[PDB]
Symmetry: C3
Subunit: 443 residues, 3 copies
C-alpha cells in the first residue's frame, strides 16, 4: 500500500528497432501406445503367463492414452472363477484287520493237572530166599557142611538146587548104605534115606520160592512197563498237539506280518507321492508370488508413466488453445498486448505449418532506448484529484505531462486528458500541479 | 437469439476511485520427494523386506516428481530369477527286504506217516500151568489128597514144587516101606516106590513148564521194551528237531520285527520333519500374501498422491506462464483489458519478489457510480443499418448517443462514429434515428 | 527471416455483418464418487472379503476426487499384524518301547551236552545152558538116549527138567531093580541107583543155571528200564519247559504286534489329518492369489480412471478461470481482442446461467467482404525508416497508405502516423515512398 506513492520509476521507450521473432507452439501430440507385456516382462515367459491373469487393464490404459474415458461399472466381463483341479488323496488304509492270534489267552482257565509220576515207576525187586552168602561160605568144599548148615526161611526150609561132585557122591553113598541096611535090618535101620528126602524137599521148596519171587518180579515189571508206556504216549501226544498249535499260530503271525509289510509299503508310497506334490505346489506358489511382487511394482511405474503422458496431453491441448487464440489475435488482427505476439509491440504476424505445431513469424518493434521517469498515481489542482486516461503521468523533474507507456510525447495536462475522482483525500499519493485548458484552434 | 434485441441494460460508469490491489501468483513449487519405505511401511521390518522385492519403482516416482519423464522400455534391469533353495526330501525307504519265514509252507508235500503204535506194545503174559486154585483148595492140610487130586496139563502132568511137612513125612514113610518090602518080597511087592517117582517127575515137569513160561514172558518183555524204546527215541528226536526249527523261525521273526521297528521310526521321523517344514513354509507364504495386499493398497494411495502432485505442478507451471504474461502486459505496458491487471481499468503495476511466487501491486480505478442505459445492436437511418465503432449505442430515453463502455460521454451519432452494414433487414434489432454530420469547425 | 520482406498479402475487411454467437464454458464439475467394492468386485463375496484387506485406499481416492489432498505420513492407522492361528501338529509317537524278545540270544553260552544214550539201553539177553537143539534131537522118543547123550556145561553137567513117559518108566524100572538087588547082593550089585541120582543132580543143576540166567536177565531188564525211564522223564520235562518258554515268547511278540498295529493306525490317522489340512490351506492360498492378481489389475484400471477424473477437474478449473476473465472482459467491458468475445470484433456480451457452466451471448460483427493488400514492414523516405503506429502499411499497387487492420481507410503517410527507427539498413525490407505533412487546417 505504501509503495503506491513511492514515486517508482517507469520506463518509457524513446526509439524502436524492427525485429523478427519465430515462435513454435505445439498443437497436437504423437499417438503414444503402451505395450504392457514388453514393459512389465522383458523376454520372460512365466512373467507374461502370470500377467495374462491380471486382466484387460492394458486395454483401458491404451484407451485412456488415446483420449477415450475409462468406464466405471461392475464386473460384467471379468470373473473370479475357479476349477479346483486338485487331485484326490490316495486312500491310506487303516490297520484294523490285523488280528495276531495267541495260543492260550483265556480258554476258560482249564488248568489241567498232569501230575506225571514217571519217577515213581521203579522196580524195587525183592531179594531171594537167602543161601547166597551164608550157605555159600558155610559149605565151601566139604559135603558134610551141607545138611548141618542148611539155610531155612521164616516158616519153611529152602536150599539151592546147585549140587557138587562130593555132594552127589555122598548122597549116592548114603542111598546105597540105606538100601543095603533095608535088606538086613528089621527095626529103624533104614533111616539113612531120611536126610536124602529132606534135602530133596528143601531144594524143591527153594526152587518153588525162587520161581514165586521171579513171577512176582515179572508181574511188577509188566505193570510198571504198561503204566510207563501209557504215560509216555500221553505226554508225547500232548507235546505234539501243542507243538502243532504253536506252529499254526507262528505261521498265521508270519502271514499277517507279510500282509502288514505290504500294506505299510503301499501307505508310505502314497504319503511320499502326496508330499512330493505338496512340495511342488509350494515351490510354484512361492515363485508366482515373487514374480507378482515385481509385476505390481512395474505396474505402478507404468501407471506413473501413463499419468505423465495424460498430463502432457492436457498441456498440449492447452497449448493448442493458446495457438488458436494467438492465430486469431495476431494473424487476423493487430494486438495491443505487450509481448504477446512475439516480444514487443505487435505489427503483423504470419503463420507457418509444422509437424504437430504451428510456427508464427512475429514482426514487432522493441524499445531501443528507454528512459526512467518519475510517475504519480494522481495529481491535485485545487481539489478534484485527476488521474490520467489513455496514458500515465510523467514528470521530468519540474513539469508534469501526460503520455502513453509505449512512446514519450509530453503533452500539457488538460481536462480532456484526465478524469476527476472525488477529492484529494482518499487517493493515496497527491501532487499539486496546474491543469491548463487552452482550447484555442488556429487556422 | 431473441435476447439480442431485448434492449438489455448496460452499466456505464460515471465516477471512479483510485484503488490499490495486491495479487500473489505462484510461479515455482517446492521440490517434493517421496520416501516409499516410510510411507508404505511404518516402522515395520518385514514390510520393508517384502517391499525390497517390488523393484525400483520409487526411483521412477521421484524422477517423475522432479520433472524427468519415465522411460518406456523392456526389462533390462529387473530379472525374475530364482535359486530353488528347496531342501531334498529325506529318503523314505521301502519295506521289501523283510521276508518273514514260515516253518512248512510247501516242502513238496512230504506227508510223513508216523503211525506211532506205542499202545499196542503191551505184555499180555500167559498164565501158569494151573495148580493155583484147584490144587491149593483140593490139598488143604491132608497129604493123602496130593496124588489123588494131582493136576495135569493138556498132554502132560504138572505139580508145584512146594511140599509140606506131612507130605514129605508120608513120602519118607512110603520110601521106607518100599525099601523094607524090596528085601523080603520076590514079586511086585516093591511097587510102593512108584508114586514117589511119579510125583517127582510131575514136579519136575511143573518146574520145567513154569521155567518155559517165564522164559517166554522174558522174551516178550525184552522185544516189547526194545521196540518201545526205539519208538520213544525216534519221537523225542523228531520233537527236539521240530522245536529247534520253530525256535530258529521265531528268533528270525523277532530280529526282522526289531529291524522293521527301527526303519519305521526312521521313516516316521523323516515324515514329521517334512511336515514341519511344509507347515512353516505355508505360514510364511500366508503372512507374506497378507502383507502384500496392504502393500498394494498403500501403493495405490501413493500413486494417487503422486498424480495429485504432478497435476499441481502442471497447474503451477500454468500459473507461472500467467505471471509472465501479466508481468509483460501490466509492468511493461498499460493493458486495456478489464479486470486483468487487478480489478478495474489498469493504470500502472509494480512487481515484488516473493518465495515461490510474484507479487503484483496493481494501481487501478474502479467505477464509483454506475448508471444503467438501454442499448441497441444497431440503428437504421433510411436504410444502411449503422453499428457503433469504438463505443456502444446508449439512449437516455428520447435521444441516442455514442459512448465508450468505460466512461459516459454522450456524442452525436455521425458517419465518422458508425459503420454501415448492408440494409436494415438482416440485422436483428432495428431502431430508427437520425445520423447527423455537421462537420463545421470553428475558429 | 527471409519471409519478412516477402510482401505477404494481408486481409483487410471492407464490410461487416452483425452476428449473434452463443458460447458455453464449463465452470464446475459434477461430484464424482468411486465405489471400489462394486468396481473391483462385481457381485462377488470372496473378492470383497479379500479387498477388505487391501486397506482404506478407497477413502483416499474419494478424498482426492472431492478436492482434498492425500496426506503423506507413516503407518499410524494400518498395521501388518498376524495372529498365527496355525493348529498344533498331532504327536507322532516314536517306536522305541517295542522290545521283541528272543529265546536264547546270548545266555552266557551254556552249551548243555545232553548226550541221550537211549539206543544203548537194549537187553542182549544171554542164552540158556544148551539142551535146546542138541539134546532135543539126540533124545527123540527113545529113553535109552537120555544118559548116553546127556549135555553138559563148561564145568558142570545140566539136563532139562522135562521128562517123558518112557523115561520115567525106565527110571522106575531101574529103581525097582536096584532095590531088589540091594536085598540079595553083598558086593557092588546095588549100583543100579547111581545113574538115577546122577540124572537127578544133573536136572537140579540145569534148573539152577536156568534160574540164575533168568535172575540175571531180570536184573538187566530192571536196571535198563530204570535208566531209560529216568532219561525219558528228563527229556520230556526239558521239552515241556522249552515249549512253555517258546509259547510265552510268542504270546509276548503277539501282544507287542497288536500294540504296534494300534500305534501305527493312530500315527497314520494323524498324518492323514495333517495332509488334508495342508491341502486345504494350499487350495485356499492358490485361489486367493489368483483373485488378488485380477484385483490388482482392476485397481490399476481404477487408478487410471481417477487420474482421468482429476485431470478433467483441473481442465474444468482452467475453463472456469477462462469464463471469469471472459465475463470481466466482455460483459463489463468492450474487448479489442479479435475472436475472443465470440467470433469477430466485440460489441456487447450478455451472460446467462446454466447448470455447471456459463452461457455467453456474444454480439459481434464479422468481416463480410475482405480484400488482400500488399504490405511492407517499413518504408524509407530519405533515410530514417518509418514503421506505422496504430495501423499497417497498405498499398493498392502504386500508392501506399496507413490503415488499421479492422477497416480499410486509406490515409496519407504523415509524421503523426509513423515513427522513425534508426536508418534504412538494419530494418529488413525497405521501400521508398514520400511522407507528406500538410498540417493545413481549413475553416
Ligand atoms: C522517489 O524519489 C526519491 C527522491 O530521489 C528517491 O530517493 C526514491 O528512490 C524514489 N522512489 C522510487 C524510485 O521508487
Ligand atoms: C481277534 O479275534 C478274537 C476272536 O476271534 C477277538 O476276541 C478279538 O477281539 C480280536 N481282536 C481284534 C483286535 O480284532
Ligand atoms: C531504470 O530503473 C531500473 C530499475 O532497476 C534500472 O535497472 C535501469 O537501469 C534504469 N534505467 C535508467 C536509464 O536509469
Ligand atoms: C522539463 O521539461 C520542461 C518542459 O519543456 C523544460 O522546460 C525543462 O527544461 C525540462 N527539464 C527540467 C529539469 O525541468
Ligand atoms: C460523480 O459524477 C457526477 C456527474 O456529473 C459529478 O457531478 C460528481 O461531482 C461526481 N462525484 C464524485 C465524488 O466524483
Ligand atoms: C497542495 O495544496 C494544498 C492546498 O493548500 C495543500 O494543503 C497541500 O499541502 C499541497 N500539497 C503539496 C504537495 O504542495
Ligand atoms: C426492454 O425495455 C422494456 C421496456 O421497459 C423492459 O420492460 C424490458 O425489461 C427491457 N429489457 C431488458 C432490460 O432486457
Ligand atoms: C521269501 O523267501 C522265499 C525263499 O527264500 C521266497 O520263495 C519268497 O518269495 C520270499 N518272499 C518275499 C516277500 O521276498
Ligand atoms: C442495473 O441492472 C442490474 C441488473 O440486475 C441491477 O442489478 C442494477 O441494480 C441496475 N442498476 C441501476 C442503477 O438500476
Ligand atoms: C436525454 O438527453 C437529451 C439530450 O441532451 C436531453 O434533452 C433530455 O432531457 C434527456 N432526457 C430525456 C428523458 O430525454
Ligand atoms: C460493401 O463495401 C462497398 C465499399 O465501397 C460499399 O460500396 C458497399 O455498399 C458495401 N456493401 C454492403 C452490403 O455493405
Ligand atoms: C423505421 O422506418 C421504416 C421506414 O418507414 C419503417 O418501415 C419502420 O417501421 C420504422 N421503424 C421504427 C421502429 O419506427
Ligand atoms: C510478393 O509479390 C510478388 C509479385 O507479384 C508475388 O509473386 C509474391 O507471391 C508476393 N509474395 C507474397 C504474396 O507472399
Ligand atoms: C530289550 O531288552 C533287553 C533286556 O531286557 C536289552 O538287552 C535290549 O537292549 C532291549 N532292546 C531294545 C531295543 O530296547
Ligand atoms: C487472399 O489470400 C488468401 C491466402 O491463401 C486466399 O485464400 C484468398 O482467396 C485471397 N483473397 C483474395 C480476395 O485474393
Ligand atoms: C490506388 O490508389 C490511388 C490513390 O487514390 C489511385 O489514384 C489509384 O488509381 C489506385 N489504383 C492503382 C492501380 O494505383
Ligand atoms: C533516438 O531518439 C532521439 C530522441 O530525440 C533521436 O534524436 C535519435 O535520432 C534517435 N536515434 C535513433 C537511432 O533512432
Ligand atoms: C531508395 O533510395 C535509395 C537512395 O538513392 C536507393 O539507394 C535505393 O535503392 C532506393 N530503393 C528503392 C526500392 O528504390
Amino acid at each position: 500500500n505504501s509503495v503506491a506513492y513511492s514515486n517508482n520509476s517507469i520506463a518509457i521507450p524513446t526509439n524502436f528497432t524492427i525485429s523478427v521473432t519465430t515462435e513454435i507452439l505445439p498443437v497436437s501430440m504423437t499417438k503414444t501406445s503402451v505395450d504392457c507385456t514388453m514393459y512389465i516382462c522383458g523376454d520372460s515367459t512365466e512373467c507374461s503367463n502370470l500377467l495374462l491373469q491380471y486382466g484387460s487393464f492394458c486395454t483401458q490404459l491404451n484407451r485412456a492414452l488415446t483420449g477415450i474415458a475409462v468406464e466405471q461399472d461392475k464386473n460384467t466381463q471379468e470373473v473370479f472363477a475357479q476349477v479346483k483341479q486338485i487331485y484326490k488323496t490316495p486312500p491310506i488304509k487303516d490297520f484294523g484287520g490285523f488280528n495276531f492270534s495267541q495260543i492260550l489267552p483265556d480258554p476258560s482257565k482249564p488248568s489241567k493237572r498232569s501230575f506225571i509220576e514217571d519217577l515213581l515207576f521203579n522196580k524195587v525187586t525183592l531179594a531171594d530166599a537167602g543161601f547166597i552168602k551164608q550157605y555159600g561160605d558155610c559149605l565151601g568144599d566139604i559135603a558134610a557142611r551141607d545138611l548141618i548148615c542148611a539155610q531155612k526161611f521164616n516158616g519153611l526150609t529152602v536150599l539151592p538146587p546147585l549140587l557138587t561132585d562130593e555132594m552127589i557122591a555122598q548122597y549116592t553113598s548114603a542111598l546105597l548104605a540105606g538100601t543095603i541096611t533095608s535088606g538086613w535090618t528089621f527095626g529103624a535101620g533104614a533111616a539113612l534115606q531120611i536126610p536124602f528126602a529132606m534135602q530133596m524137599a528143601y531144594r524143591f521148596n527153594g526152587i518153588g520160592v525162587t520161581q514165586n519171587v521171579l513171577y512176582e518180579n515179572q508181574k511188577l515189571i509188566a505193570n510198571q512197563f504198561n503204566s510207563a508206556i501209557g504215560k509216555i504216549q500221553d505226554s508225547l501226544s500232548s507235546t505234539a498237539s501243542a507243538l502243532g498249535k504253536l506252529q499254526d499260530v507262528v505261521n498265521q503271525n508270519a502271514q499277517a506280518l507279510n500282509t502288514l509289510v505290504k500294506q505299510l509299503s503301499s501307505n508310505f508310497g502314497a504319503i511320499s507321492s502326496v508330499l512330493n506334490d505338496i512340495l511342488s505346489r509350494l515351490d510354484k506358489v512361492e515363485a508366482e508370488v515373487q514374480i507378482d511382487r515385481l509385476i505390481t511394482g512395474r505396474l505402478q511405474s507404468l501407471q506413473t508413466y501413463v499419468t505423465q503422458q495424460l498430463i502432457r496431453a492436457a498441456e498440449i491441448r492447452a497449448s493448442a488453445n493458446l495457438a488458436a487464440t494467438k492465430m486469431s489475435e495476431c494473424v487476423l488482427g493487430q494486438s495491443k498486448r505487450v509481448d504477446f505476439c512475439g516480444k514487443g509491440y505487435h505489427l503483423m504476424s504470419f503463420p507457418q505449418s509444422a509437424p504437430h505445431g504451428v510456427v508464427f513469424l512475429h514482426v514487432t518493434y522493441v524499445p531501443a532506448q528507454e528512459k526512467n521517469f518519475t510517475t504519480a498515481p494522481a495529481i491535485c489542482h485545487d481539489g478534484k484529484a485527476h488521474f490520467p486516461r489513455e496514458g500515465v503521468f510523467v514528470s521530468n523533474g519540474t513539469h508534469w505531462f501526460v503520455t502513453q507507456r509505449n512512446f514519450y510525447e509530453p503533452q500539457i495536462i488538460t481536462t480532456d486528458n484526465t478524469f476527476v475522482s472525488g477529492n484529494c483525500d482518499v487517493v493515496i499519493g497527491i501532487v499539486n500541479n496546474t491543469v491548463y485548458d487552452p482550447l484555442q484552434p488556429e487556422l
